RNA sequence: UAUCUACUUUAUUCCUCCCUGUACGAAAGGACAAGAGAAAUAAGGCCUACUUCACAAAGCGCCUUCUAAAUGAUAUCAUCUCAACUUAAUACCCACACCCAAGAACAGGGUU
RNA sequence: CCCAUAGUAGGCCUAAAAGCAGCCACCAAUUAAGAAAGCGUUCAAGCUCAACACCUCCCAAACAUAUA
């Protein structure tokens, strides 16, 4: 990438830019996700991909740079949120209750003071509906609402 | 309860099982398709006649002038036979590549103003472009030879 | 009575009179995930890195 | 074809390969042979046997008693070869059939101890406010069998 | 714990399972080392039961309890 | 004439002064907060005085009452962020018999 | 995101109502800004759009990963 080094002299210097890995097993895709057979094969667990696709301060890169499709760009967005709040990204800081699979920001969720009757119960959302299309290695499907 | 009610009437449970079983299942594609791979001719003719019209070309940086200021500069440039021309650069690159302008390709991008003429009077444009402390005279080309800005000064002198 | 058979402790600290009775340490039901810190070099090297960053981008 | 090491890439269940049937049937042959030697050399203590008698399966060993809820059409004291053995095991080995063991391989032999009836059982029906009250007293016939012997033959 | 040997017989009608006992290794072993309310509280804490089990019952329940119950084995 | 359930010791408000007729606004206008008062109610107690009154119980009497800022990506500006982060209950209670400020009985306190 | 000159303060009636009080034409310039699409003024002046140029007190407890 490039860096803006200032000291008053200020300059922009390009340093240490990577490239593709030597082989994609399924080339001729449009996105790296579609090119490495990861269309429906990641989660919030794996912070390898999620570490690749983010800025060093926890933000993402725009889709015009990474070349992702819209579907898995939104999926990577939600997985960044789910992995940051679960505490899986401790080195991408701006400068205590344990969680995982947190869809919404924990600062702006109202408690369910009155859950409804058995036919109108207000459920607790777990996981995200963007990851609904994952590969189903479980006999019963994901329960996204608890 | 009548069969036509103001509110939605609750179906008998067998009928609701029918409405659930018979529900429309849309076809799932195997691979998702998003992840699968006269005016322009008039401009071609016009800037072509411009290109075999002029002998030397100078270009400028004109979006940074007011409406009244562009009116005045048009006024003091009207006393000459020179014409001004601005047009999009995404069609100007085919014009530069078509006129074998290899050394004019990395010159005409962004906001630029063309100053087509056939005889030298760039001296008084230098005079009136020291009167405003901006808007440099960009590099041009006389008879397939690139004119730099120091070349513009030498050609003016 | 079943609830009185069960003993809960909030920390790593367990009293000695209960640590002398345990037999089996039950496996944790949830697969614990691990961060960037607990990744070794061989794990991130064995993972292929996927894409071309543009040479001129500020981050 | 290639997917890198990722959480949903590999299955959560551990990979297992089943051996190809050649050395597996060699292993089966040596195991059956060696169990046959244990049978013929008397390497068993007492035997247990799951036996499908009248309509239900019994975990039958030697020297013991069974209650059966019907007439068996036998006078007391005659012996019986209970067919439909369907599991026979010892301290070290078991033999279970598909779904039965052959009559040349297991001999389970029982004696008829007694021919009683059950205690008087109550069948009472009662629907309220409909004056519905019926009462019946039943005594079901029963026979108790003494399993005598469960012996085995070395035919494998 | 898992180590047994299964084998289908030759004609394939019976399943012969072989299962000896696993003996505990010597190296996996250790050597042998050589009022009324407070009473209910102490017994409850010592046996990890509630208090309610330790209070006595009335005479009616003490009399219905069978004194020579049928014993099997 | 109460048989059964249930149950029988879980600090506010007004007005006055000060701050201040300050800040605020530009003049008119006009703060908060905190503090000092004077009251009233409620709760919890008490008899030195007053009053009903007298080995004491009372009140009209007295005492006490503690959601918001920056930073920032997706969408390189910006953006409070169902984006990541950073920052802004103590107390109370606890070992015969006679008299009692204890009390329906039982209990409880004292009996040097 | 930009970017907003000029025939013109289009005529008619209207104190003047100018693109914006109303009728009718809605031509035309550079390369292109509509005799005019929303604030806005008695009216104006100023502002945004397009287009040019970058593009009574809730109520089972719970659980998203092990092969129908
Ligand atoms: Zn794709």
Cβ atoms < 10 Å from Cβ of A59? 11
What DSSP assignment string belongs to D37-48? HHHHTT---S-E
Domain range list for chain A: 1-146
Enter the tokens of residue C45: 């090297």
d(CA D46, CA D55): 25
Q: How many Å lie between the alpha carbon of A34 and the closest alpha carbon of chain D?
A: 11
Q: Do chains D and C touch (3 or more CB pairs under 8 A)?
A: yes
Can you tell me whether residue E71 is helix, strand or coil?
Answer: coil
Q: Does E9 touch chain D (CB under 8 A)?
A: yes
How far CA E16 is from CA of D36, D88, D96, E19, in Å, comes to 10, 10, 7, 10
Q: Are the C-beta atoms of B136 and B59 separated by less than 8 Å?
A: no
Can you tell me whether residue A47 is helix, strand or coil?
Answer: helix
| Helical ranges in chain E per DSSP H | 37-47, 59-64
Q: Are the C-beta atoms of E43 and E36 separated by less than 8 Å?
A: no
Q: Are the C-beta atoms of D80 and D150 separated by less than 8 Å?
A: no
Q: Name the nucleotide nearest B67; use CA and C1'.
A: G5
> Between the CA of B53 and the C1' of F33, what is the distance in angstroms?
82
- Do the chains contact at E53 and C1, CB–CB below 8 Å? yes
Can you tell me whether residue A113 is helix, strand or coil?
Answer: coil
Show residues of chain D in contact with A137, CB under 8 Å.
8, 11-12
d(CA C53, CA A98): 34
d(CA C25, CA B92): 76
d(CA A4, CA A13): 7
Q: Are the C-beta atoms of B117 and B80 separated by less than 8 Å?
A: yes
Can you tell me whether residue A79 is helix, strand or coil?
Answer: helix
Residue D115: left if φ>0, alpha if ψ -120 to 50, beta else—which one?
Answer: beta
Contacts of A114 (CB under 8 A, 6+ apart): A122
In A2-143, the DSSP E strands lie at: 2-6, 10-14
Contacts of C25 (CB under 8 A, 6+ apart): none
d(CA E17, CA E8): 9
Run of H or E residues at A88:
none
Burial class from Cβ neighbours inside 10 Å (0-12, 13-18, 19+) for residue A77 reads middle
Q: Are the C-beta atoms of E32 and E46 separated by less than 8 Å?
A: no
How far CA E50 is from CA of C15, C18, D73, E37, E58, in Å, comes to 22, 19, 56, 13, 19
Chains touching D, CB cut-off 8 Å, 3+ pairs: A, C, E
How far CA D16 is from CA of D19, D86, E7, in Å, comes to 10, 30, 19
Q: Are the C-beta atoms of A82 and A103 separated by less than 8 Å?
A: yes
Residue whose C-alpha is closest to residue D145's, from D87, D78, D89: D78
Instruction: Answer whether the bond into residue B33 is a cis peptide, omega within 30°.
Output: no
d(CA C40, CA A44): 19
d(CA D110, CA D76): 12
| Helical ranges in chain A per DSSP H | 32-35, 47-52, 63-66, 70-85
Cβ atoms < 10 Å from Cβ of B59? 19
d(CA B55, CA E48): 107
- Do the chains contact at E14 and D105, CB–CB below 8 Å? yes
How far CA E62 is from CA of A81, D69, E65, E66, in Å, comes to 66, 36, 6, 9
CA B145 to chain CA centroid, nearest Å:
25
Can you tell me whether residue B129 is helix, strand or coil?
Answer: helix
What DSSP assignment string belongs to B16-63? HHHHHHT---PPPPSS-GGG---HHHHHHHHHHHHHTT-SEEEEE-TT
**In chain C, which residue's Cα lies nearest the Cα of D12?**
C31
**In this structure, which long-range contacts are made by residues A53-57, counting pairs with CB atoms below 8 Å and at least 24 apart in sequence?**
A53/A80, A54/A80, A54/A89, A54/A92, A55/A92, A55/C59, A56/A92, A56/C59, A57/A92, A57/A93, A57/A94
Run of H or E residues at B77:
helix B67-78
- Looking at the 3D structure of chain B, how many domains does it have? 1
Provide the residue range defining the domain that includes B2: 1-157
d(CA A8, CA D61): 98
Residue whose C-alpha is closest to residue A78's, from A61, A97, A102, A99: A102
The 8-class DSSP code of residue B107 comes to: G
- Chain F nucleotides covered by protein, CB below 7 Å: 71-76, 81-86
Enter the tokens of residue B108: 């005409």
d(CA C45, CA B43): 55
Enter the tokens of residue A141: 């499907």
Is beta strand D141-152 parallel, antiparallel or unpaired with respect to D132-138? unpaired
> Between the CA of A14 and the C1' of F70, what is the distance in angstroms?
31
Q: Are the C-beta atoms of D148 and D109 separated by less than 8 Å?
A: yes
Resolution (A): 3.5
d(CA A85, CA A101): 8
Give strand pairing partners of D56.
Answer: D53
d(CA B63, CA A38): 48
d(CA A130, CA A105): 16
Cβ A145 to strand F below 7 Å? no
Q: How many Å lie between the alpha carbon of A146 and the closest alpha carbon of chain D?
A: 22
- Do the chains contact at B34 and A39, CB–CB below 8 Å? no
Can you tell me whether residue B90 is helix, strand or coil?
Answer: helix
Q: CB within 5 A of ion ligand 1: which residues? A: A 30-31, 34, 69; B 35
Residue whose C-alpha is closest to residue B146's, from B111, B89, B106: B106
Q: Are the C-beta atoms of E8 and E15 separated by less than 8 Å?
A: yes
């Amino acid at each position: 990438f490039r860096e803006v080094v200032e000291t008053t002299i200020i300059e922009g210097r390009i340093t240490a830019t990577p490239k593709e890995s030597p082989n994609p097993p399924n080339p001729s895709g449009q996105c790296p996700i579609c090119r490495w057979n990861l269309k429906h094969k990641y989660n919030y667990d794996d912070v390898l991909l999620l570490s690749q696709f983010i800025r060093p301060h926890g933000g993402m890169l725009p889709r015009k740079i990474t070349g992702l499709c819209q579907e898995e760009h939104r999926k990577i967005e939600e997985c960044v949120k789910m992995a940051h709040r679960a505490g899986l990204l401790p080195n991408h800081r701006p400068r205590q209750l344990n969680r995982y699979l947190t869809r919404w920001a924990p600062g702006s969720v109202k408690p369910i003071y009155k859950k409804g009757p058995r036919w109108n119960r207000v459920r607790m959302p777990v996981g995200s509906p963007l990851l609904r299309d994952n590969v189903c290695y479980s006999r019963t499907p994901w329960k996204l609402y608890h | 309860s009548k069969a036509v009610t103001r509110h939605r009437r609750v179906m008998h449970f067998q009928r609701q099982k029918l409405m659930a079983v018979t529900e429309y299942i849309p076809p799932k594609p195997a691979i998702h398709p998003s992840c699968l791979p006269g005016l322009i001719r008039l401009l071609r003719r016009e800037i072509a006649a411009v290109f075999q019209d002029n002998r030397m070309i100078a270009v400028c940086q004109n979006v940074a002038l007011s409406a009244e200021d562009k009116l005045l500069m048009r006024h003091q440039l009207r006393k000459h036979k020179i014409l001004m021309k601005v047009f999009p650069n995404q069609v100007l690159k085919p014009f530069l590549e078509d006129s074998k302008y290899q050394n004019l390709l990395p010159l005409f991008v962004g906001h630029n103003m063309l100053l087509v003429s056939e005889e030298p009077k760039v001296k008084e444009m230098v005079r009136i472009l020291r009167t405003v402390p901006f808007l440099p005279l960009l590099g041009g080309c006389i008879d397939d030879t690139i004119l730099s800005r120091q070349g513009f000064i030498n050609y003016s002198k | 009575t079943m609830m009185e058979r069960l003993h809960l402790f909030p920390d790593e600290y367990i009293p000695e009179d209960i640590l002398k009775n345990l037999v089996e340490e039950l496996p944790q039901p949830r697969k614990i995930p691990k961060r960037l810190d607990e990744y070794t070099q061989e794990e991130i090297d064995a993972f292929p890195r996927l894409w071309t960053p543009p040479e001129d981008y500020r981050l | 074809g290639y997917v890198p090491k990722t959480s949903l890439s590999s299955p959560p269940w551990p990979e297992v390969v089943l051996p190809d049937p050649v050395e597996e049937t060699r292993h089966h042959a040596e195991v059956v042979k060696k169990v046959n030697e244990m049978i013929v050399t008397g390497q068993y203590g007492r035997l247990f046997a799951v036996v499908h008698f009248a309509s239900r399966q019994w975990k039958v060993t030697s020297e013991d008693l069974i209650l059966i809820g019907n007439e068996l059409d036998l006078a007391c004291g005659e012996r019986i070869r209970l067919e439909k053995v369907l599991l026979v095991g010892a301290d070290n080995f078991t033999l279970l059939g598909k779904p039965l063991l052959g009559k040349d391989l297991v001999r389970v032999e029982a004696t008829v101890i007694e021919k009683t009836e059950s205690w008087p059982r109550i069948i009472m029906r009662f629907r309220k406010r409909k004056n519905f009250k019926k009462k019946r007293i039943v005594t079901t016939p029963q026979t108790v069998l003494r399993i005598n012997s469960i012996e085995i033959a070395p035919c494998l | 714990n898992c180590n047994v040997e299964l084998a289908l017989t030759s004609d394939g009608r019976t399943i012969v399972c072989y299962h000896p006992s696993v003996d505990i290794p010597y190296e996996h072993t250790k050597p042998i080392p050589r009022e009324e309310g407070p009473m209910i509280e102490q017994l409850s804490k010592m046996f990890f039961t509630t208090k309610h089990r330790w209070y006595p019952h009335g005479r009616y329940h003490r009399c219905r309890k069978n004194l020579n119950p049928p014993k099997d084995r």
